[PDB]
Amino acid sequence: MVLSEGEWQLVLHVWAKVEADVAGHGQDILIRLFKSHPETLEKFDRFKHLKTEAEMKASEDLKKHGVTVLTALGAILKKKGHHEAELKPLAQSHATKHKIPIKYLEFISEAIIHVLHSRHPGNFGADAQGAMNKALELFRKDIAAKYKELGYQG
C-alpha cells in the first residue's frame, strides 16, 4: 500500500500537535491500551503489577516508556513510508525478545486513534482519521512481513 502526499500531510499535521506533549500523549495511549486490553499488560514484566489507572498515571517508568514508544513511532511516520531501516531492529526485538503478536499492534493502533480523536477533534476529522489508519495499517503490514522473515509472524 502507498499513501498520497495529501494523506501524509494529514498524519504529520496531527502528529505535530502530539509532539507538543509527548509524555502526556504516551501516558494516555498506554493507559487506554492497558485498560481496554488487560492481556497486553502481562507482556511487561516492569508494569505487570499495576492494578489501577491511578497507579499507572503515577508510574514514572510507564511515562518514560510512553515517550520512548511515541518517539520511535514518530520517527517512523516522518519517513513517510521509507521506514525499512527503522523497522528492522523494532521487528526483531518485538518478535524475538518480547514476543508480541500482530494482534496486539492492532490494539495499540485503536488506542492511538482513540486518544487523537479525544484530544484533537479539530485536526482529526474523518479524512485525517482515515489517513492515520492507513499509515498504521502500512506499519502493521510491513511489521507482519518482517515477522515472517524472522520466523515468527505472531
Ligand code: HEM
Ligand atoms: C506503535 C507500536 C510499537 C512501537 C513503536 C514500540 C516500540 C518499542 C520500543 C522503541 C521499545 C524500546 C527498545 C526495544 O525495541 O525493545 C519497546 C519495548 C517493548 N515493547 Fe514496544 N512498541 C510497539 C508496540 C508494542 C506492543 C503492542 C507491545 C505489547 C502489548 C509492546 C511491548 C514491548 C515490551 C514488552 C517492551 C520492553 C519493555 C521493557 O522491559 O523495557 N510493544 N517497544
